[PDB]
């Protein structure tokens, strides 16, 4: 089936201590989200660059993790129903707040946690390169030679193109069908691993430390081992979803060369170019493409989506 | 009267070459905007820090211009009517595009140019500290001892607190009156120079290099001395504005100590605290406070607003 | 009117980490005291020297913050009624104990928090030097040219002379009137900003971590995220107060030259010398003069005292 994705965004300092606490406080949070029965998986990325579009963004590069001061992190979290997210965040509030507040000594911006729904998916299951001679055997056994996937190495061995679009009111489903068609054509590139399209449906306030007046002061004067009341969030998830339709396109690639030259096929390939020029005529903003590196993942989520 | 403010936002590399081209291409653009008769002034800022709210943003500091990789710039531009902006941007298109594209070799993000209207203003006119013995003389001459302002040094000798809020649908005018009242109380701080409140009304597409399909390719493959057609912008200014109403609060201070301890009066002062806790109960996001430094300005704009 | 001042005294290590936690845990505590309605303001000082009285204290100097191992800090806190202090300290006990115990890794002595009442006050309101052309305008408007004050820069731009006296039983009101008269004469110095006289009325036990037997062990074996019972304080505020009446004289000066040569006027000026020699004939101990530097302040307290 299709899960929803809550994405937790933050910007942190780029010190070694930041990565130490990524390695320490990272897994623990993941263990508190698994207490709910609707949780299906997770994936954690760090930004490593921006695709420069030639010289449209002349000061950006596909590798900037060396000469930089701030590192931006995005956590994907996959749910069967988006109310599972809102009922897990507030039943494990004591653990979650203190864990995520141990992280706040290094933050420059955020967190901001919006909620998206999957309107399209082409994601294969991940495997190692020692895990593929026993996968094609099972497929040729059951007489299914047309459903053997591409090898998709887990645990930080592939890149993600993270494209942000915002769409004019009155062009939404046009955008949706055009982008689906262009991905159908684009899956032909040498290195394409999978893709999905996400449509923003709302914003979570408890996951973004966004309280009313009483909770804001409790957040400001927190020594570390106390919590605000989680019911002091003034709005609900669908109450304030942004009017320009915000969409994410998440494409996977084997390496940054494949990323650079495959995402550029929509510019160089005349068929794909004419197909993609109906995406452009609906955008308020975009596309803005980030290059993400997946540090860790609950790979089993891809099982649920393909069951 | 009240002008509108178009704000041009960008993120650039933090090299010395960036500041060289700030000093060179900066004034020239300003000379092309002055060709329209509705242009009333301008102000240019660079971000120098983030107010950490104690340790809410633990990795931020009021001075980060040293240990950083990217510098964010915001240009204010003041218009009598927001259609003056849309008719100046496209009658000087040849000069403007090439000037602003000479800048694109150093950009990491943007530009994004939204359009705001002034709903409140308390801005005094700027003066040097050698310019104040001839100002009180004219005021005491005309028997007006209650309208002598505070000294507000121009050309980079004061700080700006740039607070971003977004408001829940259904709480807008409540936010407006509450924030006006809290600024009325807050003008008592030791170092307060002035303040204004801006309400986002739309987004300009020509000023953000946001074209359709035909113009996007012309932007991508531009050697430098060519222009896209400026009428290939798919949307108009009011067509796409955000669901949470985006407000800016722009407060001026003599120095960063006054900024740190005056913007904190809303937290420490019980009267001001209880007045300000009606602002907080309407926010989808915020407040997020940046510290800006004004490198240059068309100070005469403050004349028009106070005439 | 007149508030009471609770003064929190401590001695800490003089490392950079001490100042880091001053900048971090400092504001947060200040935000927890503002929850009571009787709280009117605050002021925080660090000791930077001792006035050597020629060579009476030959090893002391007006600047010792460089070659030193321990830094002594004094917090002033201003209350309408001294029971406001005792009812705020124990209703916010959970926040306050953990905040002030995060500080205990660097302490050499204290804290000791005695409670004083204001018997005399001459404190003007603080202003920046860009804030004074709009202050005299309002005063000349309302025909009040004799109540325009001296400029008193906030946020660490002035020095404090902190003089400690103790008075023989049977000489108290003699001391009081003599010191008031000598301050009336002394306000003539070139650089005098203001002064106040405080008379010690008692000691707070909850604010000095002074519990009985049950609470002392809870303080000793505290991991950090627990609290003693705040009602295990064996004595009340007026129960214990020193037999020699403890007085503080708090004088403000523009700079340490003005401090050195203005506090010495009582020695060099024959009129002031003969007036001040009735202060000396009542002292058990003193005067001992410290030089304080105000790092931060809730300046609005000076409004309440002058309303
Ligand atoms: Fe969440
Ligand atoms: Fe513009
Ligand atoms: Fe106390």
Residue numbers in the entry:
A (entry chain V), B (entry chain D), C (entry chain A): 2 to 308
Sentences from the paper on this structure:
Due to their thermostability and relatively easy purification scheme, both SOR and LS can serve as a model for the catalytic and structural characterization of biocatalysts as well as a benchmark for cryo-EM sample preparation, optimization of the acquisition parameters and 3D reconstruction.
First, we determined the structure of the Sulfur Oxygenase Reductase (SOR) enzyme that catalyzes both the oxygenation and disproportionation of elemental sulfur in Archea and is composed of 24 homomeric units each of MW ≃ 35 kDa arranged in octahedral symmetry. The resolution of the final cryo-EM map was 2.78 Å according to the estimation from the Fourier shell correlation (FSC) at the 0.143 cut-off criterion. The catalytic active site in each of the 24 monomeric subunits contains a mononuclear non-heme iron site, where the Fe3+ ion is responsible for the positive charge of the inner surface of the hollow cavity in SOR. The density of the side chains of H86, H90 and E114 surrounding the iron center, and that of two water molecules ligated to the Fe3+ ion are distinguishable in our cryo-EM map. The characteristic feature for SOR is the presence of chimney-like protrusions at the 4-fold symmetry axes. These tetramer channel structures formed by the side chain of residues at each of four adjacent subunits are proposed to allow the sulfur substrates to access the inside of the hollow sphere cavity of SOR, where catalysis can take place secluded from the cytoplasmic environment. The exit routes of the polar products such as HSO3−, HS− and S2O32− are proposed to be the hydrophilic trimer channels formed by three subunits positioned along a 3-fold symmetry axis.
